[PDB]
Design a protein around this nucleic acid. Structure first.
Ligand code: MVM
Ligand code: MG
Ligand code: MG
Ligand code: MG
Ligand code: MG
Ligand code: MG
Ligand code: MG
Ligand code: MG
Ligand code: MG
Ligand code: MG
Ligand code: MG
Ligand code: MG
Ligand code: MG
Ligand code: MG
Ligand code: MG
Ligand code: MG
Ligand code: MG
Ligand code: MG
Ligand code: MG
Ligand code: ZN
Lengths: 50, 106, 61, 52, 153, 84, 26
RNA sequence: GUAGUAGCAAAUAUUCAAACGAGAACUUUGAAGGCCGAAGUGGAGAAGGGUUCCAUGUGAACAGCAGUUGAACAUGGGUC
């Protein structure tokens, strides 16, 4: 919305934190069956919508 | 082996007949590739950008009726085509098309 | 072999539109060597990218 | 069982659609929405006379 | 791996295989029967011509709505078509099968194609948009390819 | 035009992030919250939606202080330190 | 290496019924 | 099964050559032929979208053909 308030920029800050893939060393641990990030979000398809 | 060079006039007014207006002038160049392929035997035909400007200089639906072209046959190298030979069509100007005929010119 | 960066970047430097700003496809790698406005401002002032002056719309008719 | 054989909430569509008259859960998006709700013969339905 | 019809002179026959390759199944089946039994010199030479549209591939079992063509008179049939991408990938496996014939040390120009199987793969799913806001699926049909090549003794 | 070509007119947000439960439910045009009732004193829960109690009663947060009250009760709220 | 994309939940929606209502027999 | 079937038909349009590349009807440049024609297919914002902006890299997905491309994926930047 291109000029905004600070509560939204804290909310939007955390959603870009979430939005990065899986490193290749957690995948090779012991006690693991995670293959990818299922909470991955792409902005064309799935909005967060606050 | 053969490196000949001939000079042709091609009656475009009959080789385009009934091709629609927005499709007219590309078939002029499809036909010259069909013309240059057959006249020399070789398949590979590269026409000059000078030849392109001469066809297209009156729009896509008003092509000049006959074009004195020049057919040259050359050859390709340097990790080459599977062909040995190809064609380089170039545009030689002449005003009027009477008494001219297909004269093999070095 | 991808000059879309140098396409846009001259237009901000010449302060004119994108549709015009061109000559020399022959020195392709000579342009693609460059990646900055400093770099491309040398390349304007020695003759790889020219202004291509304005299409004519005479009022003589 | 005692409860929560059907925690869910559903009503049935009825006539004008070709499905059936089992209750169908209400909503969309989550792909259980539209499926068969409580009863015997459904996935995640309660059992027949839930044992007491 | 395992093949249908593991061969009967197995040291004197080289083999090749393909799995999960994005083409159409029904097109790749009919071109396999055109291949089957042809010498590998002619197997090279036939599949150049399908991509050049000079020589057809008859559609024998999956025939629904294929138009007639001129070149099915080589096959005793009416309906032919000229699949590029079936021929592109099926010419690929023959060079891979040539490559295995090189390593084992055969006489690679006595090789006929004994057995060639093409069978459907786990199909990948996409979606497109019909009227009234109803999704209908829109899915691939890749196929697995096997082949056995046996010398004509 | 009852449907699609009047959904393009959806532009202003009514519900907004509130500060007590924080669930995009704060009706700006009234200044109240539909989930936990912000300007009121008391946390909105009712007995007709059992799952809503299940979504926001205790046990689902951390209980980051109320846990160690249960830990201290195992010894009866000691106030000394240790032996050496 | 990347997880397979799409395959999102549907969400079928209501559509017109009984074709073109038109005129009932009477 | 229907099935390699319907179908990929709204708004005038492509062409020739050249480079990189396993690989070019679409990517890039260059020339021609064009249309939006100043109530614009242009230049900038409010709302809303939230990294989409920029750069580089790959070509299994995805882009309803293809791709050597991208508002894709991966990495790194930028909002005084
Ligand atoms: O599009 C439709 C339309 C036509 C037929 C169906 N039906 N009926 N039973 C059906 C079963 C399967 C598929 N379709 C079906 C649905 C809609 N229209 C329409 N026509 C006449 C009456 C009502 C309507 Cl809504 C609009 C109206 C205005 C002009 N433009 C077209
Ligand atoms: Mg949202
Ligand atoms: Mg209940
Ligand atoms: Mg159950
Ligand atoms: Mg047909
Ligand atoms: Mg559609
Ligand atoms: Mg819709
Ligand atoms: Mg209206
Ligand atoms: Mg207060
Ligand atoms: Mg068809
Ligand atoms: Mg038809
Ligand atoms: Mg080239
Ligand atoms: Mg190349
Ligand atoms: Mg007009
Ligand atoms: Mg505008
Ligand atoms: Mg960009
Ligand atoms: Mg690359
Ligand atoms: Mg595609
Ligand atoms: Mg991304
Ligand atoms: Zn609240």
């Amino acid at each position: 919305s291109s000029h905004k308030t600070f509560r939204i920029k804290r909310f939007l800050a955390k959603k870009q934190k979430q939005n990065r893939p899986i490193p290749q060393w957690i995948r090779m641990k012991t006690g693991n069956k995670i293959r990818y990030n299922s909470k991955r979000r792409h902005w064309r398809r799935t909005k967060l919508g606050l | 082996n053969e490196v000949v060079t001939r000079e042709y006039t091609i009656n475009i007014h009959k080789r385009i007949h009934g091709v629609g207006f927005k499709k007219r002038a590309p078939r002029a160049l499809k036909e010259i590739r069909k013309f240059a392929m057959k006249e020399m035997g070789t398949p590979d035909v590269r026409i000059d950008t000078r030849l392109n400007k001469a066809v297209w200089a009156k729009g896509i639906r008003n092509v000049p009726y006959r074009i004195r072209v020049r057919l040259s046959r050359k050859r390709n190298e340097d990790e080459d085509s599977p062909n040995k030979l190809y064609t380089l069509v170039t545009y030689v100007p002449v005003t009027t098309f009477k008494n001219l005929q297909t004269v093999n010119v070095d | 072999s991808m000059l879309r960066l140098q396409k846009r970047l001259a237009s901000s430097v010449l302060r004119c539109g994108k549709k015009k700003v061109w000559l020399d496809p022959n020195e392709t790698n000579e342009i693609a060597n460059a990646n900055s406005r400093q770099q491309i401002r040398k390349l304007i002032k020695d003759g790889l990218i020219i202004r291509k002056p304005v299409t004519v719309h005479s009022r003589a008719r | 069982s005692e409860l929560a054989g059907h925690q869910t909430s559903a009503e049935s569509w009825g006539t004008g659609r070709a499905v059936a008259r089992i209750p169908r859960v209400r909503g969309g998006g989550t792909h259980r929405s539209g499926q068969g709700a409580f009863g015997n013969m459904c996935r995640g339905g309660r059992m027949f006379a839930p044992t007491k | 791996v395992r093949y249908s019809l593991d061969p009967e002179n197995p040291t004197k026959s080289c083999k090749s295989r393909g799995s999960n390759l994005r083409v159409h199944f029904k097109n790749t089946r009919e071109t396999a029967q055109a291949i089957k039994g042809m010498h590998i010199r002619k197997a090279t030479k036939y599949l150049k011509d399908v991509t050049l549209q000079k020589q057809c591939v008859p559609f024998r079992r999956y025939n629904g709505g294929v138009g007639r063509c001129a070149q099915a008179k080589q096959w005793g049939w009416t309906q032919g078509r000229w699949p590029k991408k079936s021929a592109e990938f099926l010419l690929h496996m023959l060079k891979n099968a040539e490559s295995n014939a090189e390593l084992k040390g055969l006489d690679v120009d006595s090789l006929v194609i004994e057995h060639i199987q093409v069978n459907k793969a786990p199909k990948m799913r996409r979606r497109t948009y019909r009227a009234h806001g109803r999704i209908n699926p829109y899915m691939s049909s890749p196929c697995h390819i096997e082949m056995i090549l046996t010398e004509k003794e | 035009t009852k449907g699609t070509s009047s959904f393009g007119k959806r532009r202003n947000k009514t519900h907004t992030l509130c500060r007590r439960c924080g669930s995009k439910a704060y009706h700006l045009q009234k200044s109240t919250c539909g989930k936990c009732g912000y300007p009121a004193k008391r946390k909105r829960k009712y007995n007709w939606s059992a799952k809503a109690k299940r979504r926001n009663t205790t046990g689902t947060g951390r209980m980051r202080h109320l846990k160690i009250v249960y830990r201290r009760f195992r010894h009866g709220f000691r106030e000394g330190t240790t032996p050496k | 290496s990347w997880w397979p994309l799409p395959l999102l939940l549907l969400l079928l929606l209501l559509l017109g019924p009984a074709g073109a209502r038109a005129q009932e027999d009477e």
